[PDB]
């Protein structure tokens, strides 16, 4: 109902939908798609842009610097995230020590040819540094004017919490967010264990993979299709998870899920969207696209959000019978 | 272990988390019953109460469930303090 | 609800500004009563005054109204701080 | 009495009265005319000018840079001021988030050709930032450079010890002052609680529309003149505030007020402006002119002052009716 | 007016520094008696000894020469207190 | 002398390194023994244990070796407490 | 004995004299016998230069700077400090407001050629200033690279304390040095004063005109001389001073310690200075000269200090009359 | 076993062994040997690499820079170290001052041609300079992103614990290691009060001189070799040590360790080396050649620590005799 709306109890107002750059950006698809898609995006109203070092060894962020600086949209009007942790094959090039933290966000903005980007997210925890270290190091980026906020992504309740703890112990900076995976099929986290986390110390919830690599789509109803994520080299991980026993069951719940798709006249994908933007819980969702009529049926997924009344919510949990216990 | 911090009218106490989820249904035990008086901005949990009192209801959850009446805390005060934190004696 | 710290003699009390204002004459629940100890450095209220007697005088506030006088606290030395502090019995 | 005097408890020095660019600076009068009366206001001895993001979408910024780097005057003999809260059309463009007002008051140094302000002001109240935020980012852009000082403007008095409050508590800095509407028609915020906050926490009252917006001066009389702010265009608003019930109520009480002037030797506007510093707690009146004939009639209210007798004022609030009760 | 803090092994009072000036022989109203106590790195006097006792050595100061012992304190762990503070009684 | 900083439930106790010393086998002055109890990000050793103790046992050190049952304390709390620090009587 | 020593409690070492600009330096000497003079004092040892915003109105500060630059010595084995106040007739280009003490400073810098002074000084009290502010601007210049180190000048020891503590209050900088008048005639505050700061909070005693002008050199003995400091203009109230009734016996002092001079083989000058380093408590004495050889005749000084035997100073405290009590 | 390791608690990952620059860098050998000695480290997995502004009067830090910038590897894969304290003739270009560590390591950076080193070391205590003014630079130089985290070298532990305890005391940054001697026949600080620390505030040791500067290498069992370090200019205090009476007590027990070596199948270096890294106590070992048979030979090190069993280590003790009593 609130296409705009705070990132947490931060001050930050991103949109409900986002667009990311895995596999896609500077990989999948070409840097014209991408420019392509990334106008769609923000001519209908998205403001946020997800990235990550690691994304096609960089290449990700280069493609991304270059339309935004192509498009001249006003730097103000953006909301650029990147995530650090994989950056090199070095020995220091990975992790959340000072050193990298500091090494990787400048080199994701020269590639990004941007000054700063307004949230950094550590992409996953580091067992091999300590948290104050991790805690001083987002700290210290923010305050040489290199990052507006930083984020978690992948941490466990407990982790959050920690760094909340230690960023009040020594007054730094507290993360303002969680990027954390959400669809039908990953429910408990985002769910169960993120809204008291909200309400506690206001920790948004960004989410990822809506269509669980694109599995919610329903295209792989009958098999792998040519040129589809799963098809793609380096990826036979997903094609293993598709064609596996769990994978098979997962596409005859969404079969059942496509017949109350039609039943509310939008496609299976706009309906998986609009699932996971039903509950306040969620600041923003960010898409994947490798088409443009993939992104704006994905974004058509905005206008089904009212019909997702309580029955039909309570239906879906039925087929799927994961709903989480608080 | 994770430890937390609990403000008293200015006095701060702290100890485990686990020493205070040792009897879940208590307030300081329960989660959901505990929220309402959660700080962000300092990390603690507040309470606008009596100061004298609080040394033997941390005690209670320290001493595995012992209740001792404060020497200096007069009897229905204390009475009130344990009703308020929901302590209770039956073992 | 905004809260207000009273340091007295290093120890500090902390306590809701509602509470205090639930007696308006006093010299703490009025504005202009307690302005002159205020302390914009450390955004407390100071005063160079007995330690052990102002637990009573919080719990005045706190319990509505009750005037309890500490077990360790002389009965002239408390009846000064009533004074100062200006604190009504009468109900 | 003093002409200059300390902005609240803080060290920075201003002249009583100031020259404020909104509706004029790029809008109503020219470059031309803007040059002439600042160097009119800077040569009588004025040193604060204020301004703001949104005058005139930014423009109102531009030609102060421009009239400050053309006349050459020395920095130091300046207190420039500006306010941020309106910066633009997209969501992430307004506020008091750290994006905004990083961005936000980057953007005014770019335009003023400056690279700090003295004092930055929140241009009001924002109900979606958390107070915290907002402190840590004005104690940022400070600590950067970017501003010597800041302030609030439209605050209650609960949200400005707020940010005192959470200052201390995390050892930031706390505003100096508070932008206030103060003339004869909007009294009981400076009046009755600006001053418990002066020495409570030292915080400042600067002043503006000392004239209601030209009010005051006397020239709706007959209704509204050729040219004037209410005859603009984007000011109906204030057209309808003048030609209201209580808009002609007021000027029924300012036929009163102009016999106390004519009595005492002054002009109106002369006697609304003295009127408004005639109490300490004020540190400056921010005036507000289209011609110069205006601004040095204004500046005459100086010499006003001294007449403003104890019975002067009491004849004052008996024709008002509306002396504020403390 | 100047304040001056004294921490008691890690108990801190604080007062004005003209409160301890009233008695300028004792060893906390004489600057070069205890200007050997002094911590620069946290402006503040730290003395390794008895806390329950402090509470009567300020007083002392406040109340202008009232030397109570304080009831949870023993008589002759008290007696060696006023010694090393070097207060007297007599006036 | 170089000082050490012991949290006992949120209330600090600060005292000199060589007045643990004094008792090398005693819990807090083997740094062996005290060793499991340190905070690296405060720099204190932290005890979830009984507050009204603790001031008997830091006096223990203070005093040279005398042991007091502070009277708020019941004689079954604080002879637990002398069994976890571990201190002796003997002399 | 020990020509380089600590400034109070501080790792800066400074050499046990040092020497200043004021008077001399953009003013009464020529740059090339400013280049001349400072030049022979680095050669001897000396690494403290001082100066200040004020004077010559900022020329003494651009003479020292090219000196510098033209003679090419290392930055790192210089120690020059400067002091701010009063640096302009504008309202806002006087005090110690966080204003002045940032564009005070930087102007300095500038003119100097500096990229930062080793230690900045307050001139004087601000009456006019908060405390906190003040400290939290010494702190923020330091914490900027602009200056290493902060102290104050003609400070009482109320004040210095004050600072003191603020500093410890919100963990900022404490000042660690006092410039203090300190000569024959002048001797309180540097004897009884500042040595209870120095052992309780570490502030050092940097001392000023040794000489109290030249009056303690004795070449007033007849009258003023041709081209003496109190001949120059503008300095009328140095000539006041010295032909007063109290000036007059300040004469009739020096013609006895003249004797006690000569007793040991010394000049005027030479005891005088030499007299003012007999105690530990002064960190460093700074020199004026408008001569080469009144330069390297104080310099000289050095060799005295071993014969001020305890009977030589009881000799010269029955003269002087004004020994202070402690 | 484990070849890269976290340095102390820190999240800085170093290599188990690193080459440092004292004596031969910019002096006893060429740009050429440098160049091929640094490449040979690098490509066999070393990251840490050790230098001083000290070693070579700053020659060291010059050729090092060089090396990196001709060679073009990443920055974020090198983890660089330089040590301050001896910087130059004048008073203040030594020691532990904030004025010194600044310019000093703003120097190193220079001559290095490095925007930052990963770790800036106190090359020794300063009994002249405050630990509170020593932690406040050190903390400063990181904050301004002029090296990544800083160490001691030769201080004791209770001056290690008193940087600690003052960084907690003022919210600074504490040093994460201590640079130590140690070898055979240094062994008391690494062994028994070093580990002490570690557990309990994290700081790692980083050891040097693992082979005594050779010493321990067995070639001077007859003598001292030509061209030998021993047999440099400015080095005849190693000469006398070797000679000395004591010198010729550690050659006969070398003689042993020499046996034992042979029966292992390794030569008496990369025994005293792989000696070193027996125990996880130590982070990495800094390395010292000449020759590039030399640096391969002592690499080599790495394969002989599996043989060093219990029983092996217990027969190097009873041969030695100095094993430490904790
Ligand atoms: N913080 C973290 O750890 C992570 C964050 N993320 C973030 O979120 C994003 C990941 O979501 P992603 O994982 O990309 O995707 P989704 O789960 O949303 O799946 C999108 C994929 O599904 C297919 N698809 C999309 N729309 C349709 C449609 N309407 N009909 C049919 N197929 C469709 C496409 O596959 P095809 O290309 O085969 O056509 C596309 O690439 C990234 O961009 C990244 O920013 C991702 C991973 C980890
Ligand atoms: N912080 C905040 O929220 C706000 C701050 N302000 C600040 O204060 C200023 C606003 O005051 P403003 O509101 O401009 O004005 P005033 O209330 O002082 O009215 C000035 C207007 O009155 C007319 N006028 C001025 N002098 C005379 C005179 N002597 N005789 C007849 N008419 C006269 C002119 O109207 P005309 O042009 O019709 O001739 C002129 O523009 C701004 O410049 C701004 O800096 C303003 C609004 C909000
Ligand atoms: N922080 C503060 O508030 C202040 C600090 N200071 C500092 O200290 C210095 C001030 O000392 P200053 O006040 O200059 O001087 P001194 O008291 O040392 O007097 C030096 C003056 O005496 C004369 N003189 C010097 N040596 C001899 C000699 N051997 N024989 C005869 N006459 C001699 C010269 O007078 P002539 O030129 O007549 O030959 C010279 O300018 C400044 O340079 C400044 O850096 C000064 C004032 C205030
Ligand atoms: N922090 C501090 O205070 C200090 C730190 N250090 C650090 O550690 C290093 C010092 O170790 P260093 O002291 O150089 O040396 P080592 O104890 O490791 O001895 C290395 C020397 O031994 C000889 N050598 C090396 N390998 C062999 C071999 N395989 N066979 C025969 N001889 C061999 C060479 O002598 P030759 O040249 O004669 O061939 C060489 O220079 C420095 O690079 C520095 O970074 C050093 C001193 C102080």
């Known amino acids: ?161 920690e760094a909340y703890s230690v960023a009040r112990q020594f007054n730094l900076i507290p993360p303002i967010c969680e990027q954390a995976e959400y669809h039908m099929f990953q429910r408990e986290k985002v769910e169960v264990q993120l809204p008291e986390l909200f309400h506690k110390i206001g920790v948004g919830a960004m989410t990822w993979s809506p269509l669980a690599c694109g599995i919610v789509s329903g295209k792989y109803d009958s098999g792998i299709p040519p040129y589809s994520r799963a098809s793609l080299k380096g990826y036979q991980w997903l094609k293993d998870k598709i064609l596996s026993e769990e994978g098979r069951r997962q596409q005859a719940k969404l079969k059942e899920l496509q017949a109350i798709a039609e039943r509310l006249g939008c496609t299976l994908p706009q309906l998986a969207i609009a699932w996971c933007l039903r509950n306040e819980g969620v600041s923003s969702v960010l898409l994947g696209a490798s088409n443009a009529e993939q992104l704006m049926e994905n974004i058509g997924a905005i206008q089904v959000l009212p019909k997702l009344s309580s029955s039909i919510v309570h239906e879906i949990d039925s087929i799927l019978g994961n709903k989480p216990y608080s | 272990c994770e430890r937390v911090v609990i403000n008293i009218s200015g006095l701060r106490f702290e100890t485990q988390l686990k020493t205070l989820a040792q009897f879940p249904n208590t307030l300081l035990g329960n989660p959901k019953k505990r929220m309402r008086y959660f700080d962000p901005l300092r990390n603690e949990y507040f309470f606008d109460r009596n100061r004298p009192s609080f040394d033997a209801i941390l005690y209670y959850y320290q001493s595995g469930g012992r209740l001792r009446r404060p020497v200096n805390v007069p009897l229905d005060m204390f009475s009130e303090e344990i009703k308020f934190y929901e302590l209770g004696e039956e073992a």
Chains 1, 4, 7, 8 share one sequence.
């Open chain 1, 1 to 161: 109902l609130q296409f705009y709306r705070n990132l947490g109890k931060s001050g930050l107002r991103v949109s409900c939908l986002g667009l990311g750059t895995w596999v896609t950006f500077g990989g999948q698809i070409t840097d014209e798609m991408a420019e392509h898609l990334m106008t769609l995006a923000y001519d209908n109203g998205i403001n946020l842009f997800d990235t990550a070092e690691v994304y096609a060894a960089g290449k990700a962020e280069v493609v991304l610097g270059n339309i935004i600086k192509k498009k001249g949209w006003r730097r103000s009007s953006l909301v650029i995230t990147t995530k650090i942790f994989w950056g090199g094959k070095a020995e220091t090039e990975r992790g959340l020590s000072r050193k990298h933290i500091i090494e990787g966000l400048k080199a994701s903005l020269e590639r990004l040819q941007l000054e700063y980007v307004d949230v950094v997210f550590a992409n996953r925890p580091d067992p091999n540094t300590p948290m104050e270290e991790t805690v001083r190091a987002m700290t210290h980026v923010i305050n040489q004017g290199m990052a507006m906020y930083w984020g978690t992504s992948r941490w466990s309740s407990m982790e959050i919490m």
